Amino acid sequence: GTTGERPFSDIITSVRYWVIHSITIPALFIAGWLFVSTGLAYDVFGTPRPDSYYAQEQRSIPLVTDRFEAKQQVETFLEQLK
Amino acid sequence: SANLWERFCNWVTSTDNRLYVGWFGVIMIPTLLAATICFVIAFIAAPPVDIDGIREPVSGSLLYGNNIITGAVVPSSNAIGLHFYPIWEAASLDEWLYNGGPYQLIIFHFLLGASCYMGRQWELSYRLGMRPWICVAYSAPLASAFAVFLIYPIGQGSFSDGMPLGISGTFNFMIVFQAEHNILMHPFHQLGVAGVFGGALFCAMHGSLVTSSLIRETTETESANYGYKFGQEEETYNIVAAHGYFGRLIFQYASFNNSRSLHFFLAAWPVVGVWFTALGISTMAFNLNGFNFNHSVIDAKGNVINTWADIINRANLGMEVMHERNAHNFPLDLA
Amino acid sequence: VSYPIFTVRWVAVHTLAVPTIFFLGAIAAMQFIQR
Amino acid sequence: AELTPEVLTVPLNSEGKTITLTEKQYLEGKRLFQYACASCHVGGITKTNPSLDLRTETLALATPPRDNIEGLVDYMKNPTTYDGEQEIAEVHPSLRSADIFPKMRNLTEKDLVAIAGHILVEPKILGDKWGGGKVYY
Amino acid sequence: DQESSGFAWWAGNARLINLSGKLLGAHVAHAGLIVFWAGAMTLFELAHFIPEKPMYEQGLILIPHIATLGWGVGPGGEVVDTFPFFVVGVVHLISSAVLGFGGVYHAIRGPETLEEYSSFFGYDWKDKNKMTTILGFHLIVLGIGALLLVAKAMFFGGLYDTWAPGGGDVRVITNPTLDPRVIFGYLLKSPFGGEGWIVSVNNLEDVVGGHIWIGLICIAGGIWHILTTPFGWARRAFIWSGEAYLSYSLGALSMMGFIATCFVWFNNTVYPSEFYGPTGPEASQAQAMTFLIRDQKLGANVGSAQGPTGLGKYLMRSPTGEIIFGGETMRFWDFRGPWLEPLRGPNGLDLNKIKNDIQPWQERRAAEYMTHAPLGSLNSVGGVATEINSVNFVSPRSWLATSHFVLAFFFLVGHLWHAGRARAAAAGFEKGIDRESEPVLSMPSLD
Amino acid sequence: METITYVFIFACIIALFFFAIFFREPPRITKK
Amino acid sequence: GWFDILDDWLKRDRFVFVGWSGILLFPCAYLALGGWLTGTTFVTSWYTHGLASSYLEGCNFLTVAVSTPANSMGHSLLLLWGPEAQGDFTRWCQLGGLWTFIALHGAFGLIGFMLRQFEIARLVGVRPYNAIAFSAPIAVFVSVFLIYPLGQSSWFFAPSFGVAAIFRFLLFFQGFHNWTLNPFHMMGVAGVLGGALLCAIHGATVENTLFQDGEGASTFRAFNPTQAEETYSMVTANRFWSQIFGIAFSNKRWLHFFMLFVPVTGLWMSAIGVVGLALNLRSYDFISQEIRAAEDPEFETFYTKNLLLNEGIRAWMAPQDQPHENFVFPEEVLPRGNAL
């Protein structure tokens, strides 16, 4: 009923754990927060900002219409200030 | 005679009957027989029914051009609504068959008996000295029948809006339901499929695990089933070997080792899930529908950015716009 | 017993725990984006 | 793709003169539109009378013209039929019938200008959606 | 005192079945929670309440309960003084502290049992005399409460009558229906379409009158139980145990939970459409009204108008001949409402009153109730499932009906559960089949 | 023809139901 | 030999068993779930479906999804280094490269997992009936997320990974394929619904036919983890159901295999039906019905009714559901009932 690993119960209870994780856990949190709040996430995944779905006048959708020249076609879609 | 009535009660309650006719059975047996006989005759030979009360009779019986898949017993007329429509409330049977009379006779008799059926699942358990609550598990599929045949009609104000007694008729009930209530986007329903999917999942889980951990008592060319005799003392499978395997598939503590904690979970999961799905239909019977995220996410200017929730809405419109063609005279569907 | 620290379990635990909180922090921030 | 003041420039009166609303007015109008209009005028239609919508063109062919701030504001005080040959303040929310329609009691001239602006700005943003019904949803 | 060697943790409260003292602590502390909610919620509602705006558009379910009792409201359900709302809220919130005090006390300080610290309050589940007596006490307490409503209606102010002659207004009832033939007649009414059983009450005279009967009958049965014991049959039929008594009361609440659901959904009188929303039928009725009113003004002869099916666009007949509204609204021809009745004749909707007796207040009333039908989403978006976000609204009639059906049902499940256990507990096999004496093995094979 | 076929199969299932319940193999204990 | 030492390490009994299978399972299984959770929060579906599909754009747990690639892509594998994305990651994301990522990875993850079942079973020395069972979820995923779109024009018509995005997949199949009328699907639900019955009824039967092996009411503790006597009365359960239902089990070994058979057989039938939907070989109509309905305008069944609903679904959904077709349906051409 037992294996090599240190019983979770003990670790989650050890003061040493929290001494470590009161630092580590919030750190990742703030890191993820900044990832969004700095707008970096928008560029890593090409996700449109609230003012970047259409052009000012245009009401059409930037649908990719051919596979091979898709990347080129997408870039052209960003051109029209979209 | 020790006393006629005293003997009668001893006969009813007797646990020596091939089928346990209980005290609930005294009500169950007749009502179910009426329900089934009326159904069988209707499904085969009943004439078309003016379901929507718009003098637009819908034929759902075999002899009138239907097959098993399309055939159904059509719900009572919308002109009747929630009014009680027994045979003795009609000038003739012709009229009774035209306004969907049989439907009420069936659903009332079924729901009554099927309730007594639950009552009997307690009684026999009482007479045999075993624990009750088996009937409690049966309360979930019954509560679904109640919601679909009674609660929803009560909420909507008519028995014509209850689920038809037929294959294709049930499909109609669903599609329309989806249009008017967006049931797929309702928590209670999602819990239902979760209970139903999980149910089938766990049913296969337990099924496989057990049958896979059977103790060898059979030949190489002999049915593995014969390795069990009705009325055994000891177990026929190694539950400790089962737990050993499943405990390693995921991880030990995420595995059952208590047969009683296992079978409780096996029963609890689907029953609770269907309970919610039954409560879902009963809740959406008063128009508390699923989530409405139509035109939620909009861009910086105000343009509407579509989601899958909007694509769902388009399909729903198609259902709504086309269902019950000639039944509507006014813009809003409040019925 | 004299349990170890870094184990295979530890690795597994962290492959899910570490990104989770990073995502939970990211998503928590999105609640304030507007237009 | 944003709500520019170029978009928030709507005709003030019949004599061509225009007015430029602010993002504060828009939101406020939009909020006031939900408070007292949406009930019957959700998405630019009219549930209790689908023949008449809140399209700028429909408001333009009204009598008097209701396709401007002055027009709409007047309507919200003394509403008439499409030909204007009949006052309908008794069966329609307005200032002169705030006793009958309590929602209209709070509403001040500032509120009326905001709601009016909202009706003229929405079709500039939504387009065909603002006028049509479930077809454009 | 009590731990694992009694029940499991997840069945903890069952360890108190035979601890009268502590078991009193729960009920008194529990009773505080109900008063606490009632109080804290009323203040929450008022804190958000907007006077010049319909109550049903604000998510209120307690302030409209107070309004019904003729408090802070006037003509047409107009909100006059919000003080009675404030009072009812704060008074409860205070009493919860008093109740909460006793609860906590009896549960962790006071005697763990009562039998010795006072033989009057101490009790035995199998003591058919004490049980019927304690039952008798509450049967009086509830009895006086029923008269507390009669007093408020006849003396201390009255109730909100939507059926008010001059139009919906707080009215003092000074003529309660005491005719037993009329009162108890409701109990003999069908529960289907038309004959609506208890929910079919349509005037405050019957409401006040009936409560007079209930109040007296209740106290009368209350005294009866104090001075008696269960008969012969009464003892040979029921199961006498702490759980059994619970089960009986569980099924009781379930039934009442179902009756309350249909009451708030159908009834127009004790659930005024002025404070709550328009009832389901009422709203659909309103739409037929609205467009009959419109199109008729465009020059249409509503009486002779032929719809797509050839049935009657605006007006048709019921199965018994009465003139009713057309369309899908044919199912709601059983609707009665203050705004619509003046158009009704001896044969249903009169074509003459419809043609020229339509009043403006009825037109906008119909428009109101039409655009506020009890249709909405879980996230509170008023309208059909295909509607667009804009109107944040869900009829209070919808919230109450759905919530209380969920509760009523689960309580029917709770009933079966506790009723099934009590029977097995009594006979003594609620913990498993006796390995030795297995009942089934002593019965002949049916095969 | 179609109607006949549908009812026939249905009737056969009900017939089976009968035999399945009342003409099953007697479930014998221990010594099986 | 290093092999047997590599083996030794892998097959070591840990908290989380690795094994040979783990070399395939864990990498894919992690990337698939990871890929989803990534796309769910960050990546959009604007350039592919004209849809917002992430928390970053404002979607909630229900409306979020990892949408399929464009119809332009075809059945392209959409490799990060493929002709489409051209090594670019951001582009890869916007072209729905994450879908083929999740799909293909999850697929192998399902292979590894069943392999794990096989590998672990062998070591523990138990029968691989857990692996046989797991074939049903495999067939489904294979048939629906792979076979089906391979028969269509592109990956675009495959189910998109997300809650709401699956709901449209249901409604689509109703509208276009009339999926509910398919005999293979019906067997499917019959297996799932019936399997969810066996699960409930068996659990309840056992818990309420138990022997008394303790003095407490909470009978959970009173179980012997080390086999011996049957914990519940199999003989009493038999006599029970034989009198209330008329039919009853009397062979636990058969009872449990049956619990394996029903839901596994069902999922397999529902799979075949979908495989047929790939070539669009649906069970859409009944010819005998249509012929009468054409000649006779008074003939109406619940079947005809349903077909009209499909017509509405197709017409009103197609425009925004199939952008690549550039659909334009005038209001006048839209099929509609009266008033509505």
Ligand code: CLA
């Ligand atoms: C008057 C009402 C009432 C009363 C007094 C009791 C009293 C009792 N019940 Mg009981 N029961 C009731 C209604 C009632 N029940 C109903 C309606 C049901 C149907 C669901 C049940 C189902 C039930 C079962 C299945 C069992 C009992 C048991 C018991 C006994 C032990 C108490 C216990 O387990 O607490 C423990 C309490 C809990 C573990 C709390 C459960 C929490 C619930 C499930 C969640 C509620 C959801 C909540 C609204 C959401 C909040 C959101 C959250 C995030 C905060 C006790 C005699 C047990 C027993 O020993 O039988 C005699 C037992 O096994 N009851």
Ligand code: CLA
């Ligand atoms: C309505 C809710 C409710 C109520 C009234 C009770 C009441 C009770 N439970 Mg209980 N219980 C509940 C829900 C409830 N339970 C639920 C949901 C569960 C499942 C998790 C349990 C599980 C459970 C178990 C397992 C046991 C009890 C027991 C008891 C009894 C003794 C309490 C005790 O040990 O004091 C201990 C008190 C403390 C540790 C301090 C708690 C602080 C106090 C009580 C709360 C203060 C309230 C408020 C903040 C202060 C207001 C002060 C103001 C008026 C001035 C008592 C009658 C025990 C029993 O059977 O009695 C012998 C027992 O063993 N309960």
Ligand code: CLA
């Ligand atoms: C049961 C009676 C009841 C009813 C009919 C209502 C009705 C209402 N409440 Mg309310 N409320 C209640 C009890 C009730 N409440 C209680 C007991 C509390 C204390 C927590 C509150 C606290 C409260 C607040 C703070 C507010 C309301 C508001 C409202 C209104 C808006 C409804 C809404 O948005 O909720 C939507 C709620 C949901 C969708 C949550 C549903 C939760 C379900 C029941 C969970 C079911 C899951 C199940 C239990 C899982 C268990 C299974 C497990 C054991 C396996 C509405 C009139 C709001 C209002 O007035 O604004 C207009 C508001 O702000 N209520």
Ligand code: CLA
């Ligand atoms: C459900 C209600 C209820 C019941 C049945 C009991 C029962 C009991 N309590 Mg008690 N208690 C309660 C609520 C209740 N309490 C509350 C809410 C509090 C908080 C204030 C307390 C605080 C409390 C303390 C501090 C003590 C008790 C004690 C006792 C025991 C001795 C009897 C006693 O003190 O009465 C004696 C008093 C009377 C017999 C007469 C009281 C009459 C009052 C003043 C009028 C009440 C009016 C009422 C609301 C309306 C009813 C009239 C209507 C029919 C017209 C007894 C078992 C004592 C104890 O533990 O001893 C064993 C003790 O020391 N209780």
Ligand code: CLA
């Ligand atoms: C909720 C309050 C309440 C409760 C719990 C009880 C409880 C009890 N009373 Mg009782 N009683 C009460 C109030 C209450 N009383 C009042 C207010 C009065 C004054 C009228 C009486 C007058 C009274 C008398 C005169 C007698 C009792 C007796 C009894 C005991 C046996 C009851 C029995 O076997 O019924 C079982 C009921 C039946 C077997 C008949 C079933 C047929 C029912 C009534 C019709 C079907 C119900 C249906 C589903 C509901 C539809 C509504 C209907 C109108 C259509 C029991 C302890 C008896 C006793 O033992 O004396 C001490 C007795 O003789 N009671």
Ligand code: CLA
């Ligand atoms: C062992 C686990 C495993 C498996 C089976 C896969 C499987 C896959 N991954 Mg993958 N991946 C994994 C782990 C794994 N991954 C890990 C741990 C990461 C994190 C770094 C990734 C990150 C990742 C990304 C980022 C992408 C994939 C993709 C893919 C798919 C296409 C890749 C391809 O073309 O393979 C190529 C196969 C091989 C290279 C095997 C060759 C083995 C031979 C024996 C070596 C011979 C080499 C030699 C030089 C040849 C000489 C011949 C001579 C003529 C030149 C495929 C389903 C792509 C995808 O999903 O597209 C949609 C994609 O874009 N993976």
Ligand SMILES: CC1=C(/C=C/C(C)=C/C=C/C(C)=C/C=C/C=C(C)/C=C/C=C(C)/C=C/C2=C(C)CCCC2(C)C)C(C)(C)CCC1
């Ligand atoms: C008119 C009116 C009113 C009044 C009312 C009334 C008067 C009521 C009453 C009511 C009642 C008065 C009720 C009663 C009931 C009863 C019951 C509900 C009973 C039950 C019973 C049972 C359940 C039993 C059972 C059994 C049997 C039978 C056999 C043996 C066993 C047993 C015991 C199980 C009001 C106020 C509302 C308002 C106005 C109107």
Ligand SMILES: CC1=C(/C=C/C(C)=C/C=C/C(C)=C/C=C/C=C(C)/C=C/C=C(C)/C=C/C2=C(C)CCCC2(C)C)C(C)(C)CCC1
């Ligand atoms: C894509 C990609 C990749 C991958 C990555 C990854 C793998 C990631 C991961 C990530 C992750 C891994 C994430 C996670 C997340 C999670 C989350 C975000 C969670 C949340 C949760 C929650 C929210 C919860 C809730 C709940 C529940 C459900 C239960 C009940 C209660 C509660 C409420 C608590 C790579 C780079 C390789 C390559 C490229 C591509």
Ligand SMILES: CC1=C(\C=C/C(C)=C/C=C/C(C)=C/C=C/C=C(C)/C=C/C=C(C)/C=C/C2=C(C)CCCC2(C)C)C(C)(C)CCC1
């Ligand atoms: C036994 C027990 C239990 C239970 C408990 C309970 C149930 C308690 C209750 C408690 C309570 C039942 C409490 C109450 C409280 C109340 C209070 C404390 C009051 C307050 C009031 C005030 C404070 C006043 C006034 C005001 C006004 C007039 C307005 C402004 C605001 C204010 C609020 C200030 C538990 C489960 C935990 C556990 C086991 C044991």
